[PDB]
Amino acid sequence: FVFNILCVGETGIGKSTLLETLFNQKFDFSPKLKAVTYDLKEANVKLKLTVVETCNKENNIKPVVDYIDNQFENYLQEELKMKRSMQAFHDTRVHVCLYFIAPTGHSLKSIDLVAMKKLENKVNVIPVIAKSDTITKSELQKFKARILSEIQSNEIGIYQFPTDDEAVSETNSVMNQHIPFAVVGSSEEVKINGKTVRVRQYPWGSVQVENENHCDFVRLREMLLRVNMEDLRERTHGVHYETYRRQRLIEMG
Amino acid sequence: FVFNILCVGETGIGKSTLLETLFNQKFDFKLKAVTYDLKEANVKLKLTVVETCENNIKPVVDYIDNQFENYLQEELKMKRSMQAFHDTRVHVCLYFIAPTGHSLKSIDLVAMKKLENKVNVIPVIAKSDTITKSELQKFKARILSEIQSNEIGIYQFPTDDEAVSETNSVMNQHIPFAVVGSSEEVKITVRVRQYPWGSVQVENENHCDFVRLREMLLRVNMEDLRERTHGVHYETYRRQRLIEMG
Ligand SMILES: Nc1nc2c(ncn2[C@@H]2O[C@H](COP(=O)(O)OP(=O)(O)O)[C@@H](O)[C@H]2O)c(=O)[nH]1
Ligand SMILES: Nc1nc2c(ncn2[C@@H]2O[C@H](COP(=O)(O)OP(=O)(O)O)[C@@H](O)[C@H]2O)c(=O)[nH]1
């Protein structure tokens, strides 16, 4: 069982930190693009985590689109082989793209609108507000609204969690309500009541990553539920990869 | 007595909020300005804000040059009255660096390098409540290191006069200033930025360097910034223009 996550955003926006927080694990990244492959034990999940720093508005997202196209191409070439073995092929197709929006507190940059528009039919895009401890509660409500307004206005097809299966439709419907996720990451941890907890400690107080009243990290983490990973994978295989495949089959003649 | 402040940085980085915090006044502002008559210490200020993003720093250089040009044209007039002329030359530029936590952006080096002989540049770390105290030390160190290795002439408060050397040496030690701006007040009367996990007190030297930045407004420091604007930066402009004009 594979799960492939791509994080996109400007340098120092907190992408690597969020991945480590999400999996509670320091990752040794390897070669503006880097990736790690990591096995979860007792979960039977093989992860490929990929990080891409963005900065020529259309050129900005090109390296990301190319990476994505390449994982599709590798899978297509395997499907087409006479002597194929689809089990034992490592499927690296990107199941989810976390798009990191900087916390200016204003709105979506024009560059981010173009990027998410170019990605929408290539990958399941989930926009997140990076370093959301930067923003006060009232500023955040307004910021989230304006971002959503622009996504809707520009007809950008971001991912939505499935709400069809009655349980847990509840969990999923509330996740959708929180998009774009206000995320906080941290390498720093303290033991609290015998439990390991990630925090950002300032002179005036500490942001608790796993506290839902501080940020949406706990809501983002529910994407890792088996049912949600499956929906993201199925949508990748049956929709985005198929779009790629159809265009390629025409080109191959 | 006039004092003219320019804030430069990317949109939404806290420029207008910081001006409001510096002067404890809500202001109603490409580039925008406001004129503030600080009847406190009898000073008229022009506060200018320019949104950036080598062509990137151009609107700023042009703005600065235009104030120099107006002053020069006045100095050259047959019927001149230099007193009661409104000097709008920029006395200090607060250059906002984004709190990424890593280093100085290449764009910022180029911008500061271009501005160094046009205006007194003071780099500030915007929204410094974004950064923990431990990373903030390293971040400041890395910025200063790039500024020095790139031979960038940022402003330094004067320390040759004992009447102010203690205050000003402490100021210099905190550059680039870790700033935080505020639009709210609590009882605790305290100006704050309030989060669920605690409140930043902008006027508290343990939370940020706002109180240190504010000492720029001491009479002696405004005077030094002005004198250097007039005797150094304006002269550099003047000499070039006199060569051009013949
Ligand atoms: N305020 C804040 N800072 C963060 C957060 N996440 C990471 N940082 C800091 O931002 C800096 C860059 O983070 P990093 O994960 O390397 O950024 P990347 O270049 O996007 O991979 C580091 O100093 C982090 O400690 C966050 O959620 N809030
Ligand atoms: N975290 C943080 N946010 C700030 C600070 N100062 C201002 N803000 C917020 O940043 C957003 C944009 O600030 P603003 O002053 O209008 O930026 P400007 O475009 O550069 O003039 C607003 O939501 C402010 O409330 C600060 O020191 N720290």
**Closest-approach residue (CA) in chain B for A12:** B100
Phi-psi region of A194 (alpha: psi -120 to 50; beta: other; left: phi over 0): left
Nearest by Cα to A220 from A40, A52, A47, A22 = A22
* Distance of alpha carbon A190 from alpha carbon A196, whole angstroms: 6
Query: Hey, is the C-beta of A56 within 8 angstroms of any chain B C-beta?
Result: no
- Which residues have a Cβ under 8 Å from the Cβ of B162 and sit 6 or more positions away? none
What residues make up the domain containing A33? 1-253
**Closest-approach residue (CA) in chain B for A184:** B130
- Which residues have a Cβ under 8 Å from the Cβ of B104 and sit 6 or more positions away? B97, B142, B143, B146, B147
State the method: X-ray
Q: Establish whether residue A63 lines the binding site of ligand 2, counting it when its CB lies within 6 angstroms of any ligand atom.
A: no
Strand (E) positions, chain B?
2-10, 31-38, 43-52, 92-97, 121-125, 177-178, 184-186, 190-195, 198-201
Q: Establish whether residue B99 lines the binding site of ligand 2, counting it when its CB lies within 6 angstroms of any ligand atom.
A: no
* Distance of alpha carbon B90 from alpha carbon B133, whole angstroms: 32
Are residues B197 and A203, on separate chains, in Cβ contact within 8 Å?
A: no
Cα–ligand 1 centroid distance for A12 (angstroms): 6
* Single-letter amino acid, residue B221: N
Are residues B129 and A13, on separate chains, in Cβ contact within 8 Å?
A: no
Structure tokens, A100: 């990191």
Classify the C-alpha dihedral B202-B204-B205-B206 as positive or negative.
Answer: negative
* Distance of alpha carbon A136 from alpha carbon A142, whole angstroms: 10
- Which residues have a Cβ under 8 Å from the Cβ of B75 and sit 6 or more positions away? B82
How far is it between the farthest Cα atoms of chain B?
64
For B135, the 3-state DSSP assignment is helix
| Resolution of this entry, Å | 1.9
Domain count, chain A: 1
Query: Hey, is the C-beta of B100 within 8 angstroms of any chain A C-beta?
Result: yes
Instruction: Please give the full DSSP string across B86-111, using - where no structure is assigned.
Output: ------EEEEEEP--SS---HHHHHH
Instruction: Please give the full DSSP string across A73-137, using - where no structure is assigned.
Output: HHHHHHHH-TT--STTS------EEEEEE---SS---HHHHHHHHHHTTTS-EEEEETTGGGS-H
Cα–ligand 2 centroid distance for A195 (angstroms): 35
Q: Provide the CATH number for the domain around residue B178.
A: 3.40.50.300
* Distance of alpha carbon B144 from alpha carbon A236, whole angstroms: 47
Which of A12, A105, A214 is closest, CB to CB, to B196? A214
Structure tokens, B56: 């990137």
Residue B55 in contact with residue B196, Cβ under 8 Å? no
Inter-CA distances, B123 with A240, B50, B81, B105, B206, Å = 46, 15, 35, 13, 20
